[PDB]
Structure 1
């Protein structure tokens, strides 16, 4: 009952009408045993309808793919173009104006590889 209301406050702070346990607001019971079975149906729907909204309707499964394509270096076609393009700028000690030029060659290696999940790769920043 702690973790359910933790879910319910972070969906109340997002839209104040987009709450996960809608169409299930059935009142409590007076019983020595059966109020944990009342909680056992309140958990199972509230965390299930929270999963598919973030993962599918907000595409959280597509955000780890862009993490995989750069950190784990999976899709290497744009990456080795960019990795060859970090070579001509890191063949010298680092300066302040160099990370302003890495993002030039990053998105020059990106949109020459003409992908359609590229909006998920525009959330990537370069640290040097």
Structure 2
């Protein structure tokens, strides 16, 4: 009841017009496995509109593609240039302005050897 309950709060955050029912009102037979029928009726629409939402717009396939390109490190044409520039700055102890020049080299090489799309790869922030 809570997993469909925490579910409904997210869909309200998307929009007020988008609700999950699919109107299954007056319910609750007195007898014994009344609960689980109303459990699956809410849970299978929880299967419905989230196959509709995130795969279409919020692009979990397109985020997880670029997620797998810079830690699992595919797209090795842009990548080998920036690891060479990161190696040149990390062969010594760092100063104050040195991490800012490291961040300038990140988006330089992105438009040098182009990625799938370049204003989507701006989700990479540099830490040590």
CA 1:26/1:55 → structure 2, altered by over 3 Å: closer, same or farther? farther
CA 1:39/1:76 → structure 2, altered by over 3 Å: closer, same or farther? same
CA 1:44/1:103 → structure 2, altered by over 3 Å: closer, same or farther? same
TM-score w.r.t. the length of structure 1 is 0.83
TM-score w.r.t. the length of structure 2 is 0.83
Cα distance in 2 between the residues matched to 1:26 and 1:113: 60
CA 1:88/1:118 → structure 2, altered by over 3 Å: closer, same or farther? same
Cα distance in 2 between the residues matched to 1:21 and 1:43: 11
1:4 is displaced (CA, Å) by: 0.4
How many residues in Structure 1 have an aligned counterpart in Structure 2?
Answer: 128
Check the 8 A contact 2:28/2:34 in 1, yes or no: no
Cα distance in 2 between the residues matched to 1:12 and 1:22: 15
Specify the alignment match of 2:93 in structure 1: 93
Cα distance in 1 between the residues matched to 2:127 and 2:15: 34
Check the 8 A contact 1:20/1:50 in 2, yes or no: no
RMSD: 2.1
Alignment gaps of 5+ in structure 2: none
CA 1:90/1:4 → structure 2, altered by over 3 Å: closer, same or farther? same
* Residues 66-103 of structure 1, C-alpha deviations (whole Å, 9 max, x = no match): 12111111111111010111122112112221111112
Check the 8 A contact 1:78/1:110 in 2, yes or no: yes
* Residues 30-84 of structure 1, C-alpha deviations (whole Å, 9 max, x = no match): 4333442232222112233123311322111111111211111111111101011
1:23 is displaced (CA, Å) by: 5.3
